Amino acid sequence: MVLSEGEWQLVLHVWAKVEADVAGHGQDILIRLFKSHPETLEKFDRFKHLKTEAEMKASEDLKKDGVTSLTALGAILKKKGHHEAELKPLAQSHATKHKIPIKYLEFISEAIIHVLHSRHPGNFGADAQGAMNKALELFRKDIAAKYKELGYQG
């Protein structure tokens, strides 16, 4: 699959807004993921014990991982499809060390769309959401392929 320049522009335009507050969006997204799919929290040994949203909001560790996650995703998106080099180390750690199934990447993709929809309505209309979904699907398809090559695929 390939995105058009117009689609990449819609993706990068809303991402430019996200970058005004990376830490804030990172928290919203991970917390959304953890509330909608509690099982995903188990993968984070550092804060698997957090019991409430209040505790999650106060966690500096959770915030730091949110920033690291979004910054890595942002670098991938800015490559507009030419992300082979960026995906290699990411696919290896998540497949071999963290053991993150593709299903969880779908869950976080859902959390990303939900948060952008809530915080950037004016820059996240139907066309913009469609483009973002397409970019995340491309990301998931390529990462899944690397998982297979790495002997994980799952």
Stretch that binds ligand HEM, among 11-19, 39-47, 78-86, 118-126 (CB under 6 A): 39-47
Q: Which is nearer to ligand HEM, 1 or 122 (CB)?
A: 1
Q: Which is nearer to ligand HEM, 34 or 124 (CB)?
A: 34
Residue 75 sits in the site that holds ligand HEM (CB under 6 A): no
Residue 52, both tokens: 């409430």
Q: Which of residues 110-149 bind ligand HEM (CB under 6 A)?
A: none
Contact in structure between 134 and 7 (CB atoms under 8 Å): yes
Stretch near ligand HEM under the rule CB under 6 A, chosen from 3-11, 43-51, 78-86, 114-122: 43-51
Single out the residue of 12, 22, 87, 90 in contact with ligand HEM (rule: CB under 6 A): 90
